[PDB]
Structure of Isolectin B4:
Amino acid sequence: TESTSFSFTNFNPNQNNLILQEDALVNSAGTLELTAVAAGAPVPDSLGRALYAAPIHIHDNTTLASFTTSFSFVMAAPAAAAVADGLAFFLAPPDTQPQARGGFLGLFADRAHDASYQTVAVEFDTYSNAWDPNYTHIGIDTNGIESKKTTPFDMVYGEKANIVITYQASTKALAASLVFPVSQTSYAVSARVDLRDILPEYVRVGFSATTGLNAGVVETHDIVSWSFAVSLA
Amino acid sequence: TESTSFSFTNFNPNQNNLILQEDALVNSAGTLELTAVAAGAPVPDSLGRALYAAPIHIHDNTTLASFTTSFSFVMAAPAAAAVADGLAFFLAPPDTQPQARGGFLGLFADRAHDASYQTVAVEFDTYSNAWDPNYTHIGIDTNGIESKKTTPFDMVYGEKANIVITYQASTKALAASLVFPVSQTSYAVSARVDLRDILPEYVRVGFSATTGLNAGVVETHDIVSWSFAVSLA
Amino acid sequence: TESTSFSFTNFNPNQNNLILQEDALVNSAGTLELTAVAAGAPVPDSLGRALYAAPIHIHDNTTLASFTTSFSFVMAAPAAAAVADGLAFFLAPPDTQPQARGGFLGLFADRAHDASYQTVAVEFDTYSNAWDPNYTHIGIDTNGIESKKTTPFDMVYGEKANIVITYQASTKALAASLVFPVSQTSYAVSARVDLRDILPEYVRVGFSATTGLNAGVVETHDIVSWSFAVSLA
Amino acid sequence: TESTSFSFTNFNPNQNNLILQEDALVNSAGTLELTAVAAGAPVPDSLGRALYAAPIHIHDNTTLASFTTSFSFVMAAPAAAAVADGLAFFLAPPDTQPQARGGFLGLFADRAHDASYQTVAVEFDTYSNAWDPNYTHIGIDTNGIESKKTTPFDMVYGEKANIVITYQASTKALAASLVFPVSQTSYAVSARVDLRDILPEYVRVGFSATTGLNAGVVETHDIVSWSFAVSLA
Ligand SMILES: *[C@@H]1O[C@H](CO)[C@@H](O[C@@H]2O[C@H](CO)[C@@H](O)[C@H](O)[C@H]2NC(C)=O)[C@H](O[C@@H]2O[C@@H](C)[C@@H](O)[C@@H](O)[C@@H]2O)[C@H]1NC(C)=O
Ligand SMILES: *[C@@H]1O[C@H](CO)[C@@H](O[C@@H]2O[C@H](CO)[C@@H](O)[C@H](O)[C@H]2NC(C)=O)[C@H](O[C@@H]2O[C@@H](C)[C@@H](O)[C@@H](O)[C@@H]2O)[C@H]1NC(C)=O
Ligand SMILES: *[C@@H]1O[C@H](CO)[C@@H](O[C@@H]2O[C@H](CO)[C@@H](O)[C@H](O)[C@H]2NC(C)=O)[C@H](O[C@@H]2O[C@@H](C)[C@@H](O)[C@@H](O)[C@@H]2O)[C@H]1NC(C)=O
Ligand SMILES: *[C@@H]1O[C@H](CO)[C@@H](O[C@@H]2O[C@H](CO)[C@@H](O)[C@H](O)[C@H]2NC(C)=O)[C@H](O[C@@H]2O[C@@H](C)[C@@H](O)[C@@H](O)[C@@H]2O)[C@H]1NC(C)=O
Ligand SMILES: [Ca+2]
Ligand SMILES: [Ca+2]
Ligand SMILES: [Ca+2]
Ligand SMILES: [Ca+2]
Ligand SMILES: [Mn+2]
Ligand SMILES: [Mn+2]
Ligand SMILES: [Mn+2]
Ligand SMILES: [Mn+2]
């Protein structure tokens, strides 16, 4: 048996147990800024990822782990109608490096599906690319930017969101939920996927986010709190 | 700081840490049968309730507690169309006793709202009464059977369901999600409610269920697993 | 599998999830006072016990649960020279009632060993009765006041002490350690005992304590904090 | 607030979440052989270390964290009176590297007390060096191999032992206890140490062990299970 848990109520500028890539960085306020913020306004062409230092044993060939994770984020926008591109929580191999920005969220290099990405991601996509449905949406990505499944949702800017993602091993279900606590709205999605055909035994977990490739088509991507727990029986 | 937590992966006929009211009972297969089962058939006119033996501290007048709970259930039915009445997870005063059966779920005596009930419930409602919407639903009940908010959902008889209910003290958000892992469908609702105004400091928690009042309009109400956690920081 | 856990960093005078017996009572300052305190002084002839409300599943005939519990207490004495009688942590049948005061610590009726007590206790004994070693001591009581095993220790009055008691199921070992963190001294005992032969499947756990029967041979018995976890795999 | 926890009931040869140094390796049976084992006998001159991948946040300059760790080990020896050199659990800067073998257990280079070590350790010492007492002992190393405090203890080769180390912030108490369950003997030690003055904000945790520098003066140093939890309020 094996277990890994961790939780953050706020981050520090010198979070030695977090791996920060590209522009990610932590405020002097304790908030984790995935994408760059200059004046107090989002910048375009930005990419940032944050990973937890230790790999988690997510399966051992014959048995799968269960896991639960909760986080809360905030997106601000100078113009709530021209925004991009989104954030994602993901799982991938321990040696994962940033990919292409803009629409690819730093998780892929192009629009093809490729078994070698070995990446599973849950995305909150705010810019309709050619591979997207024409509305803001949540999507489950198995090895590609073109989701396995998506559902519509309405972003509320300036409002702290609460996310919960769970994977039950006995049914091999991965479920995600999103609630806007003050606005009182919630959205949920579920798919089955056997992690043993997709991932290596050990992965790293974390966040990724990008801003649009043009001026004014832009938004913040802040992580506010984060907790995670796994169990391998 | 105060916390409570418990989990059951299955039950035992002599579960002295549960309080079983009316018909509720535990199987030879270790499954909590809230309502009565004759051969392998649900009997009508049944009422069951099961509570945790320890009262829990859900608020101290000025501060609210956070809590999360997970349970799984199964409803079975000889006839998928003649069904009633549903099951519910609830919070109430420690000395709570069963109320009326049928569409009242063993939680209320009639259909009027009344602050003296001091009860909060998330209901899984399978039969439309005069006070219901005309479709299968999940509702949040605050001191009454007439829900204060509902959303539609479609049952899947014969399939284990996963439910998660979280309460976040800082935003007073009550949120529920329900997933059919095998059929891959999920539903979510959320409301804002200040428990300090509704409940006493200490409550007991658990489930209540009822079968319909007429022969042949009936379903089982089995609880398969359950876990709970509270934090009063 | 079943789990049970709770923690208290401080108490409330109306702690509905504890069972207060005889003299036990909680201060306006949140300190559990097991034996009576008049103006700042402990009273003689005092007896008091406190238990967590929910029974816990400690064995099921074939398998033992493992458990861990931590608590801190303080003893205050007008004269460190004449003190009695001590405090004990114990497991017992859910319906357990207080027995004799004084040297029996509210756990037993007289000095005989009787398998029907179904009581196991770890005691901090501050007065040498005829059935005791001549020195202050920690003791392990199996169905009787006359300890099955003891080690000597010296009480430091006025200092908050830290106690940790663990039972490991696979080796059937019961272990206790005590540390006075500021004075920097520590004590420890262990012994092997199969609970399936002694206790019923379900038990309540808690503390018990008493003062001397003669004016002036007295001390306080204050529980300041408490946490517990059990796991039955 | 931040937390970190993990636990291993057994290990795997490809434990990517552990950092293995020098000779450290994992058996085909799931035991972490800190020091080399050739036929079925220990090897002289061996040095092994193992750390958890993620650094842990032990303080933020003003507030200290609390922590609890539990592990089990087994030492085997061909000849009970020709054994060396012992094993240790420790905290050190994230980029800690192995030091001198033999009686330094791989934590120190010589025998001075240099504050630039930034290392705290609890050793189980099996061979008397010049700086040691003339008996097997548990010692508390703060920035040097010459323990700041020790107590005697009698080893029991072949028997699995249980160690529990707890650090408490409010009192700045470090406390160790060791139990030989089947043999029913236990030992304990405690000391007061402010980790803000010794350790950096983030440290790694783990075990180190060495065999004797001379042919035949040897013993194995195996880790069977390990559990760890921290909280920085
Ligand atoms: C553990 O041992 C107990 C003592 O034998 C069991 O209780 C006994 O169970 C018999 C059923 O096989 C029953 O006819 C006996 O009259 C009963 N005796 C007593 C002292 O209660 C206990 O069995 C469980 O508890 C009882 C009350 C029933 O609900 C049974 O269905 C249970 O098996 C044993 N517990 C377990 C978990 O097996
Ligand atoms: C939260 O509010 C309750 C009602 O406003 C408090 O109970 C009341 O406490 C009064 C003194 O504060 C007491 O004289 C009243 O009789 C009592 N009213 C009721 C409904 O019992 C409660 O105080 C706690 O509980 C009571 C029973 C006392 O034992 C107090 O010592 C307790 O503090 C309030 N709870 C807290 C933690 O403030
Ligand atoms: C999970 O399956 C893996 C691939 O089939 C195992 O790795 C393979 O193990 C072989 C030895 O049995 C070895 O020769 C192969 O080169 C290796 N393949 C790869 C891609 O590394 C893996 O076994 C674990 O990992 C290897 C590296 C060794 O350390 C084994 O001792 C480990 O058990 C399987 N993991 C488990 C938990 O069985
Ligand atoms: C704990 O104390 C450390 C020593 O004073 C702090 O590091 C120092 O912070 C200064 C910022 O006010 C900075 O100029 C110094 O260069 C730095 N010293 C070193 C040795 O790096 C530390 O502050 C954190 O660490 C530095 C790198 C910054 O990133 C700060 O923003 C961090 O807060 C103190 N840690 C905390 C939690 O304050
Ligand atoms: Ca897009
Ligand atoms: Ca209805
Ligand atoms: Ca005595
Ligand atoms: Ca030595
Ligand atoms: Mn998309
Ligand atoms: Mn309804
Ligand atoms: Mn005694
Ligand atoms: Mn030494």
Summary: The two ends of chain D are 5 Å apart (CA to CA). DSSP finds no helices and 16 strands in chain D. Residues A 12-14; D 60-61, 201 surround ligand 4 (CB under 6 Å). Chain D has one domain: 1-233.
